[model samples]
Target chain A: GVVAAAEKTKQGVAEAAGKTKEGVLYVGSKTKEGVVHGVATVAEKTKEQVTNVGGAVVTGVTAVAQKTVEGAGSIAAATGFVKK
Target chain B: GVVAAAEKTKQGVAEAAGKTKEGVLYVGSKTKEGVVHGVATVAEKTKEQVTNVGGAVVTGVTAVAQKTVEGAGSIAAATGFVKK
Candidate 1:
């Protein structure tokens, strides 16, 4: 859940920002090279941070969900619904 | 601040999930295709929610920050620090 949410946000914003920067890199904004450089910097930094966020949620949610699943299985075994 | 916080949370989890899914998709689950399909479905759904959260924060934060900036500007102008 959190993973998907994060990916969607990162892709949407990253794509949108990248597309805008692509155009600005050649013919828009304060200049040409300056805009491109700035956009690149921003994109790199944002992607780095996005990866950081995504990594945290992956293990956290997985462990939490996995534990719940195992707990359910343990209960099912205890109640004779499934094997231990 | 919220944007950064949200982004951090999203990216961290997403990448981790995706990496795990990639391997599990091939040889570590009930089957191959089933797991991949499941992961993709989860990813897509998660992305949608993440986008929703991001969009909400974008406008909300922008409005809040803009209001604060404008308020500060107005105060500065009134206090004889800057021209209106």
Candidate 2:
């Protein structure tokens, strides 16, 4: 009876352990999927804005520099310091 | 002899299961820490760039607009269309 009881207890513990392992794996995969999706969404949204803002800054700076040079040239020519 | 061997086997299996569970928890925590640090680093780097680019865009646009308005005003005055 003692040996039989020990056998039964071992079998029960093994079954419970197997179930726990399976639960851990299932939860881990779900958590990974959620985090991956969240990170990707944030990256996509921010990437678009970054690209647009970057382009705007470049264009604005170039336009300002071109106009400044032209204005300075006009002044220098009028003062007889340089020919336009 | 058979019963003693079964008992020993049960003990060994239980010990192995316990170790496996501990290993799983340890690995999970380490992986979480690594991922958290990685995300934070990426966010910090991107945030600084975004702020700088945003500021540049605003300043560039404002400066350009100021020059354009002033240049147009000068033209209007010289043409006798408006008082300087």
Candidate 3:
């Protein structure tokens, strides 16, 4: 149940982040390309930030699941009650 | 030394993956928007893919680093030489 919840949340964030990243990039490019006095390279930095933020969110969520399992195992092993 | 190398490799992948993700989205959007008879949903799909792929990469790379440390701790603790 908990895992499912996390998975759903993860999917939601991933989709939103993806949409946000692309949406802005679209608008930014359109502005620069279509307008007469548009600032250059606006799309470039927006893209970079989107990638970074979106990627970070993705990875951060991933770590929660992996680390939970890994940490649990390590802590169990660390208890020294069980022999290797 | 090894960690530094791994960090560098991770960063390089992160950057490259970001650029690749953005570049493709840019091209995909431009093609659909600029050309005649373009598919309206092409950009949508492209963005979804980029987010999925890019997010997966980010998370996968993050897992390597975190799991390495976590697994090592686990193995070390499991050896029975050290008590928890």
Candidate 4:
């Protein structure tokens, strides 16, 4: 998966010239390290946010709360694998 | 990712017997298939839910709507890749 994503990222040659020239593709590039870092940062911030809220929020947030915690694991893993 | 997740699954060991035995961990176990299946189910369900709420709900309920979709895709990919 990483290899395929990397190859896709490596593709697409483009030439830019003249002011306000139109382009078909907007050049959506996500570096492996960048994406991984993004998720890591988000997870870290989320951990802080959740911890902060855990001190004050009331109960009954069962499903979304559990899912968010579970998701952090996968997000961390994805970023790590992509970077590697 | 699949290989690493699988190895983690294989190596995990725990003793959860002796009702309510105090422990450092909860000994909760989730299989690869279980995780993947759960995500696949969620993606399909979310797609249906979005489709049902079609035909313009508001001027732009965009951010929350989009976050939900992106979250579904990541969940689906992680679950499938890990299971494989």
Candidate 2 vs 4: which has more TM-score: 2
Task: Name the DockQ score for candidate 4.
Answer: 0.02
Model 2 alpha-carbon drift over 4 Å, by segment: A1-11, A15-55, A58-84, B1-56, B60-84
**lDDT, residue A62, model 4:** 14
Fnat for candidate 4 (0 to 1)? 0.01
For model 3 the TM-score comes to 0.13
lDDT of 3 by residue, B1-84 (tens): 011111212122111112112323343333221121211211111111223211223321121112232334231132334434
Tens-digit lDDT track of model 2 for B1-84: 112212433243222122123323322332321021112112211221323322223321111111222232121011112322
Cα lDDT of all candidates, in order?
Answer: 0.17, 0.22, 0.23, 0.19
CA shift of B43, model 4, Å: 31
Instruction: Report the C-alpha displacement of residue A12, candidate 4, in angstroms.
Output: 83
Among these predictions, the greatest TM-score belongs to 2
lDDT of 1 at A53: 18
Model 1 interface DockQ: 0.02
Residue B77 accuracy (lDDT) in model 3: 30
Put the candidates in lDDT order, highest first.
Answer: 3, 2, 4, 1
Q: Write the per-residue lDDT of candidate 2 for residues A1-84, one digit (tens) a residue.
A: 112212434343322122123223322332221021112112211221334322223321111211232232111011112323
